[PDB]
Every structure is written in structure tokens, then in C-alpha cells.
Design a binder for these strands. Structure first.
Ligand SMILES: [K+]
Ligand SMILES: [K+]
Ligand SMILES: [Mg+2]
Ligand SMILES: [Mg+2]
Ligand SMILES: [Zn+2]
Ligand SMILES: [Zn+2]
Lengths: 468, 468
DNA sequence: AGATCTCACGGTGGATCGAAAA
DNA sequence: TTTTCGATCCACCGTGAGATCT
DNA sequence: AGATCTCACGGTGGATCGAAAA
DNA sequence: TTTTCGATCCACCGTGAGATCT
């Protein structure tokens, strides 16, 4: 009847951030100018919001938290995709797989001191290996569906109590049905920030190799994501600790350092290298940490690899080995798609330049796995790079959470307030609703080490400053 | 061509508080839905704003202040009124008078610590005594044009330096011409808050009477407003000081108190009445003030008249005299239109109940003028009651100033910022532009003393809590 | 003058209500 | 009937001008 | 853990620019 | 010509996530 559909009227409601009274006025005014069939009455817009929700049985809201049954959320996402974003029925026998990434991050909105929200982004819906639907900007907030948020300051224990809880549900989800087709989900925990990567890093030690025990005949199990994490989660820490273990057994060339009078001069050179490094960058070193052993944070480990040349010249290690390690890792966490065949040979060349040069130190299982087997993961799981929502993108999500809470929630009760915030986080991330944003300006294209560009494929849309 | 005029598109721009990017998106979206002739392109909306401004020669903006030549502002207001709000040419010989109130108030927005803005509201445009245009809500912000604002914390000296400056311009303004008619302005300084009324109260003493020297043959000059102020500005103070002078010469019944041993017991009873009043209300009394003599603020004088009964029973004065004074003043500052014939006789009855009862105290020129001649002013000048913008209305003006400064001003430069704020304060107060607001809820109708209702005519639209 | 206590109100979107259409 | 749609209601609460106070 | 320094970016509406129509 | 109209530019700056620090 009218011109605006109730589904695109909603897109106008959200792109303009209009409030209920503002939209009712926007309708009534342009009704009084005579033009009658322009916008739907807010009753219809509500009805149209009602289609974007999961059924009320699976969304539970409390004064502190709001969570959606992951199964129902995925069912809803698939339902929307098939409803509108396809020319349907062109695939009636083919097998249907929806590949999706997920994660979580805590924000500090300056009680509602901080929010710990789990998010899920469907990346790709594939029919029998062939692409039906893609996510046009997989590093932007336009499809970041919520799973749960809670007003609990992010701690280490809550992250574990959330990962185990979400994984015990990922294992249980059976495929979701829609208009006769049966779609199966493939979830990858990829939207992991830095400090959460540190918190979950508790895989401290393993056998010589679960796979290698050289042949690869020991197969791979991919569910629950544990491998990708333990292998390449960001990794950045467990290579730097081993490089430091080399940097202290350097004068003596022995891995089992219980030999004659070594440990004391090990600690003495440990003190000297640490003095010179605290001199040149004013950054602390691995020396002592209370939990899980002596370690460092990634916010220092990045500067460890920022100038591989200088740290290697000061620590007494080869420049080019640290350069190539800073290249292989800066290709993992670059956020750009990884050219797997090239990366396999670069990792091989690095493993060689390492072991043909360093034999007195034997390869720990973490450095064994990043180089010898790390390249296989990006191919076998075809993962989006370890990147998660952009700097600007995560800022947009957090700013819009604050906005939905302050200006667009009903103050009748606390539960109604989180209900509004959640059922707006769902609308504003629907795969149906066209919902515009202010045009982004071009950034300087992020520079990486020269050997990384040959490693990546730089046709993508992503504009981070600190972390992609 | 299109449906929305560039003049009503602006009304939609302001009623919805849309930003330039929001309006451009609102146009483009509903253009992509096919409907082409709905809104004007923002170029046209700018062109339509250009008509609401005074010519650029008379608006001067500085990093601190922004002021409009009052003459040009009134010319613009008359131009708008005649352009659109009339069925024109029905009055080609009649004489045209535009009656307008004005004032100023400082606000403290929590450097831009406070703003001191002068405002002007056209109330009534009259043709040869007959009404052509009225202000539908003369106590609401919908027509409050700005004259000047400045980021200077409101002090006593700036208010005087502004009143003299504005009055030296009101005296100089010649009538404004539009479409062949010649309209003459009649300005009344009525939008005066409480503390500004105190600041301007510096008319301390005069002769026995400028008019009465009983016959009224000494005529009235009405320009520059000085009379209305000195007579009834709010008045509230100069009657209470005289009532206190009575309350201390009470035991002795002598006005010239240089008599035998009186002054000391005058001060002693002064101390006793002050003790009992500081006991019952915990409010200080006139006793000592540094400037212009011993005085009080109106925020205490209102509680002086709040319960006339108790203060009179404690101070030793007649209940009914203070009751009738609290009635005559609460009819002056009630904010409702004053039924002049009834008020004349009530003032006469009060003057009688005062002087037939109190002769030993002679009438000071302020109490002489409020009662004997005060009733004539409201008739001769036909003033709106001393009320100024409502509590909710002034809150709306200050909140919208804050909004225009924060969200709807360009940050390119400080002068551009005040330019935006001012040329939005002008648009949002134009007599042409239909600009809607959220519907106000009904308040409890303000209660006054029983004798005031017979004094006023309560058909009006005004909803103050503290001060109309 | 400058600081704090008070406290009535603008604003939030769904839930209900009641006509009125389909 | 069953939907559509405007007018209120829900309850809180951030805010900002008045009031009181040092 | 909790606090502060840093610092690149979203957002503001008119001023200019350049085609493109009237 | 003279207007219309979209795409940038103007310069700041409040804000909010990272980084550094106790
Ligand atoms: K108020
Ligand atoms: K940022
Ligand atoms: Mg994080
Ligand atoms: Mg004031
Ligand atoms: Zn292995
Ligand atoms: Zn007189």
C-alpha cells in the first residue's frame, strides 16, 4: 500500500537514530502535508521489529545480564538470511553450511561500570562448497549479533566461566532448519582481544607433540576451537619466552642447564640483558610473574617484536631470526587473509634458519607448532585471520551500546532497560535491515614488515590503527 | 514542485532536531524508495534559513559575545509577521503598532560557565487599536527572539551596563517599514527575573511624590520603562522594609523617632522580633546590608508574605493588612492578566485599611505608589503581567541553547560556533516557521490567596511552579 | 560569591485501552 | 471476528534551576 | 588492579568547488 | 548567464580505547 516497507522504515528509524516520538512526529508532519502513503504507522514498525527477535522463550534478561540461547540466535540468523538475502529455491539438494566467527570483549563505559558482551558474526553461508551469501565487511559491526551481555567488570575468572559455558553449548547445537533446507553451523572463536588471549593462554605445557609425537598421521579434531588457540591464538607470548630462554643459555650452548656451574651465569647474563633492555625501551622483562610462571603481557611483547633488529643486537641473538619471527607473527595477527601456500614455505624457511642455526636449544612444543604445523590450520579451517572487530568498529559497537542504553531505552524498570538494549542490538545487526552509517574516511594503509606483504593478500576493507 | 516547502522542511528540521547529515540521509533514503518530490535538497533548506536572518551588517559575533542590532531584529520580526501570518492588504490606512516585551536572564550551563542573554518577544501587532496578530503563548519560548548573548558570568554591574546600553537604543529606534506599511514599536521591559529585579532596584529614594507632590494632574512619561520598574517591578522589597519600620516603632507610635529615649527600645524590640522570626522560619531579617542600605533578598521576602498570618501575629502587626498586601502583590506577580477595575478598588480598600489604622507611620513613596497609583499602570500600559518565560519555558530555552552549542554548532572556529548558536536561536523563534514540541502535561493549577482569584482573569496558558 | 540539598519534571519504548476499520 | 492505530500509562531518574547554606 | 597520559578520530554546518541543469 | 546540488574542506575537540605507570 504505502511506499516504505515496514522493514525499510525500520532501516530509516535506525540509520537516523530516531526516537519513538521523533518517528511519530516524522510521520504525522509529512501526513499533514498531504502525502499519505510515505511512512508506516509506528504500530507497523513495532510489528516489523517483532520479526527480528528470537522467540521470547530463549532470551532471558536480568537486572544485571541478558542472554540469548545461542541455538535460537543462530536459527534466527539463518532464517533472516534465507528469507530475504537470496533468490531462493536455486539450491534444493545441495548441502548447506553457515560458517560463523564469534568472541567476546569487555568495555568500560565511563553499577554499569563495564559490560562483558559475547558476540557472533556470520561470515559465510555456503552451499555444497559453493558460496551463497557472504559478509561484505566481516570486520565491521554491521552483522555483529549479540549472544549475552552483563554488567560485570571483566575479570579472568568470568572469561573462563563464559568460554566453558558457551562451548558446552556449541557442542550441543544441532543444525537449524528453514523453509525445508537444513543448515549446519561451523563456529570459530576468533573475536578475541589481546588480554583475553592472555587470560585463556592456560595451555602451559604439553607432550613432545600431540600430532608429531616426520609424519602428520595423528589427525586433527576441530570442534571447541582449543587447537587454533593453543597454536596461534595471537603465539606472541610463548615464542618470546623461548627466545628469552635461548638468550640466557647463549654463552654455554646447552638446553639441559643442570651442567657444571651454568645456572648462576645464566642468571647473571639474564640480569645484564634485562638491564640493557630496561635501558633502551624502559620495558620490563619476563623475570617474575605470580601465576602460571614467569611471563609478560602482549602489550610489551609487541614492542619486543616492533624493532626485531635492535632487540636482537642487544640480547645477543640473530637479527634475521627475530625478523622472520616478527614477520610470521605479524602475518598471523595482521587481520588480512593469509596466502597459505606462501606462508607454508616461509614457515619452513624460518624453522630451518632456526634449527640449522640453533641446535643446542631444542624446539619447545609451542615454537614447534607455530612453524611446523601452524600453517596447516589456516588452510584446514579456512579461518578469517585472527583479527576481530576493527578499532573503529569496536568503538562503534561500544558507543552504540552506550547510546541505546542512555537515549533509546525505557526507564520504566531495569529489566525493560536491558530488554531495550538487547532487542536493539539485535535489530541493528540484522542481515535483512538496510541500516546506513556516516561515510568513513580513508586511513593510511597499515604498514607491515616487507616480507609480510608477500605473505598476505591485501584486497580487503579494514582500517585499524592498533589491532585489526 | 515538491511537497514540502523549504519553509516547512525547516520546521521538520527543527522539530526533529535533525543534523545536516541526518537530514541529507533522510532525503536521500526516501529518494531511493522512488518518491522524488518529498523533501527539498539541503541547499534549499539553507536558502530558506537565509531568509530568517537579519542582514549581515547588524549581527556582530565575537569569541565571547553575539549581538544583533535591535533595530534590525525588530525590522526582521515585523517583516516575517507581515509576510506570512496575515491575509494582507486588509489594512492600508490604519495605524500599526507592534507591542513587544523584552528582558534578559543569565543561565549557568554545567570559559562557558554562564551565559547572559537578552531576549525579546513580540506580543501583539495592532492596527489602529484593533488586533491583527497575537502571540498565542506569550509565556512560552516559541517566539523568544535573541538580542544578545555573552559568555560572561552574570554580575550586578554587567546588568546595568546592559540595561543602559539597550535603553539608549530603544530610545533611538524609528518605526520599521514593510510592504508599504509603517509599523511603530512599543517595548516593555518585562522579562525580568527576581535577582535582576533586585539588582536594578536602585531607585532608593525620591521626593514626596513625583506625581502626587489629591489630583493626578502630573502626567506620565512611559518610555524607557523606569516607572513600571520603580512602581511594581516585583514592589516586593520596599513594602516589606516599610512594614518592618512599622514593626519597630510599634510600642511608641511615632514616625520621626528622634523623640525621648525611643531609638534604643526600637532596636531592642527589633532584636526580639528578629529572634522570634529566626526561631519560626530560620530566615534572616533586614538587619544589615552593605550596599544601598539595610535590605533583604526577594527569596526571603516571598516567605515573608507566604503565611501573612503568622508573621503578623509574631511581629505585632495586623493580620489582615499583611494578608491584603500579600494579596495585592501576589496578584501583581501572579503572571495572570489583571482585572484592572477590580484591582483599583482592592488597592483603595488596602490603602484605607492601612492609613485609617496606621497614621503614626506616614506612607513612604514606594507604598504610596504601589497602592494609590500602582493600579493605573496596568491599565495605561496594558502590560502583560510582570511574568516572564515560565519555569518550564526558561528551562526549555536554556536546554536548547546547550543543545545548539554542543550538537548543532560547527567546531571549525569559535566565531562560527556562536554564529551557529545565534542563527539557530533566530530560526527556532521565527514567527513563520511551524516548529513543534513534545506535548506538555497538565500541572496542578497554581493556588493563590482567595482574594487574588477575584483579582485576576484565569483564562490563559501558563504552568509555572515557582514563578510565572 | 560559591557550594550543596531538594525535588518536580522531560524523556524512554512497550503494554493496555478503546475505537475504528478489514 | 481480527488487525490497525492513536492516546495514555508505566515507573524510574538524570538533570537543572531554586533554595538553603557557609 | 586501578589510575592517568596520549592521541588519532567521529562529528559539526557553512564555504568553496565543480558539474549540471534552467 | 544564474540557480541547483552533491562531494569535499574547514579546524577544532570531546571522547574513548591503548599505553605507560604505580
Ligand atoms: K525544573
Ligand atoms: K579511538
Ligand atoms: Mg578487550
Ligand atoms: Mg535569572
Ligand atoms: Zn607437531
Ligand atoms: Zn503619588
Amino acid at each position: 500500500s504505502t511506499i516504505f516497507s515496514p522493514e525499510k522504515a525500520l532501516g530509516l528509524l535506525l540509520s537516523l537514530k530516531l526516537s519513538k516520538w521523533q518517528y511519530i512526529t516524522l510521520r504525522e508532519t509529512t501526513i499533514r502535508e498531504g502525502s499519505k502513503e510515505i511512512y508506516p504507522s509506528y504500530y507497523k514498525v513495532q510489528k516489523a521489529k517483532l520479526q527480528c527477535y528470537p522467540p521470547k522463550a530463549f532470551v532471558a534478561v536480568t537486572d544485571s545480564s541478558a542472554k540469548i540461547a545461542l541455538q535460537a540466535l543462530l536459527d534466527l540468523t539463518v532464517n533472516r538470511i534465507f528469507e530475504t538475502i537470496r533468490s531462493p529455491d536455486a539450491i534444493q539438494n545441495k548441502q548447506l553450511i553457515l560458517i560463523s566467527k564469534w568472541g567476546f570483549d569487555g568495555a568500560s563505559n565511563q553499577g554499569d561500570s563495564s559490560i562483558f558482551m559475547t558476540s557472533l558474526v556470520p561470515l559465510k553461508l555456503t552451499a555444497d562448497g559453493d558460496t551463497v551469501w557472504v559478509n561484505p565487511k566481516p570486520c565491521s559491526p554491521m552483522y555483529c549479533r549479540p549472544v549475552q551481555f552483563s554488567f560485570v567488570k571483566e575479570t579472568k575468572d568470568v572469561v573462563i566461566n563464559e568460554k566453558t559455558a558457551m562451548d558446552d553449548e556449541i557442542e550441543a547445537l544441532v543444525p537449524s532448519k528453514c523453509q525445508g533446507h537444513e543448515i549446519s553451523h561451523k563456529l570459530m572463536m576468533t573475536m578475541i582481544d589481546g588480554k583475553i588471549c592472555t587470560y585463556l593462554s592456560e595451555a602451559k605445557s604439553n607432550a613432545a607433540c600431540y600430532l608429531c609425537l616426520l609424519d602428520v598421521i595423528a589427525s586433527k579434531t576441530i570442534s571447541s576451537g582449543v587447537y587454533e588457540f593453543g597454536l596461534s591464538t595471537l603465539a606472541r607470548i610463548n615464542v618470546m619466552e623461548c627466545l628469552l630462554h635461548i638468550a640466557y643459555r647463549l654463552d654455554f650452548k646447552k638446553w639441559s642447564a643442570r651442567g657444571e656451574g651454568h645456572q648462576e651465569l645464566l642468571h647473571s647474563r639474564k640480569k645484564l640483558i634485562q638491564d640493557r633492555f630496561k635501558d633502551d625501551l624502559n620495558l620490563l622483562i619476563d623475570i617474575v610473574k605470580q601465576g602460571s610462571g614467569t611471563t609478560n603481557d602482549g602489550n610489551t611483547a609487541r614492542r619486543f617484536f616492533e624493532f626485531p633488529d635492535k632487540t636482537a643486537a642487544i640480547t645477543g641473538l640473530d637479527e634475521d631470526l627475530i625478523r622472520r619471527f616478527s614477520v610470521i607473527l605479524q602475518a598471523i595477527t595482521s587481520g588480512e587473509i593469509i596466502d597459505v601456500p606462501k606462508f607454508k614455505e616461509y614457515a619452513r624457511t624460518t624453522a630451518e634458519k632456526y634449527v640449522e642455526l640453533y641446535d643446542w636449544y631444542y624446539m619447545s612444543s609451542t615454537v614447534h607448532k607455530l612453524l611446523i604445523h601452524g600453517g596447516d590450520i589456516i588452510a584446514e579451517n579456512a579461518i578469517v585471520p585472527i583479527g576481530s572487530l576493527s578499532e573503529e568498529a569496536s568503538e562503534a559497537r561500544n558507543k552504540d551500546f552506550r547510546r541505546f542504553r542512555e537515549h533509546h531505552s525505557r526507564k520504566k524498570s531495569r529489566q525493560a532497560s536491558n530488554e531495550d538494549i538487547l532487542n536493539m542490538l539485535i535489530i541493528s545487526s540484522d542481515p535483512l535491515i538496510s541500516f546506513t552509517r556516516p561515510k568513513l574516511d580513508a586511513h593510511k594503509r597499515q604498514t607491515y614488515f616487507k616480507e609480510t606483504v608477500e605473505l598476505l593478500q591485501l584486497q580487503d576493507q579494514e582500517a585499524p590503527t592498533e589491532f585489526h
